Design a protein around this nucleic acid. Sequence first.
DNA 1: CTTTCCACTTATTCAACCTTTTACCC
DNA 2: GGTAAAAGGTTGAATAAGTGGAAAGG
Length: 299
Amino acid sequence: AYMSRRESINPWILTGFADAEGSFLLRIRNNNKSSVGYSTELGFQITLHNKDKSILENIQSTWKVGVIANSGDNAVSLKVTRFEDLKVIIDHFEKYPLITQKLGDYMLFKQAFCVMENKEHLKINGIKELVRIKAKLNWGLTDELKKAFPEIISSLINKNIPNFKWLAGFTSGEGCFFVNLIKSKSKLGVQVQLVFSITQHIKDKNLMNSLITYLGCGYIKEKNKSEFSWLDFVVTKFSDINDKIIPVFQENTLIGVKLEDFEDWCKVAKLIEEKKHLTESGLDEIKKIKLNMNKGRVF
DNA sequence: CTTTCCACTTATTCAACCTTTTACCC
DNA sequence: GGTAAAAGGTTGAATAAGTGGAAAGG
Ligand SMILES: [Mg+2]
């Protein structure tokens, strides 16, 4: 395997994608063999379905770090935990910063990086500090870690969209270009509606709200699934999609298989611009485009 | 002793999917 | 009087996270 077979991508796109996908990791493993009885591993990771391996390669090729591996049969991962390589990641994020609640996680990661850069994690005081940091990262401590270090453990990130490149990267993870086919009392009996969405956890409500000001269109939907809730930024007005959404991503290129879902959705947009969705022949072409996009896509 | 990477797991958070109802164009 | 836009859900697997094992040189 080669570090840069695939092309690199734009660092703001990389950052948008990183706001939408991936997590920092701080492992603190019980370890017989370590002087202190624990060892650590620090890093950053992204796990995607096999379909979107090209993206991991894009990133690897941009940073020149990271390992790409199988992640079970269905998925692949990029993990950076080589310690000195984390300087490349730090250097990337200082210059092209994250803006979702994940920024907070990057702050934990930096702090843990400091402790390790000084080698404090090799002694009991440094392990204690990493425990306090890990306590706030992702899912926090295992029950077993809490017994070992029962010490007492220590606010929402509020940031603006930096530019459209960030937005192309973020959409490449969390966006959806959908062709909705409404059973309708129209002539053909089916209405074609283009839907754009970006799906996000509730914590990033402010970001989602500010997408409305940013794109000059769309609205927020609160959705739920019994115990769990999430948000959608949604655009359904056709003239907004054609004059606002489409040009943005024509100028700022999506990455991964979603690029192909996007061009397929634009093909339908040209058809609707021409009123062709209102004839049988055009409805059928759309039905065929939809059939083979998104979950229906083979290549 | 410690770093690094490789194999592999699991559950809920997303993307993606649908129907029905209301807005509004004409 | 007919097409567009929004309301109002559902669906399932990809992503969010994680775990053990161990090669390799320090
Ligand atoms: Mg995500």
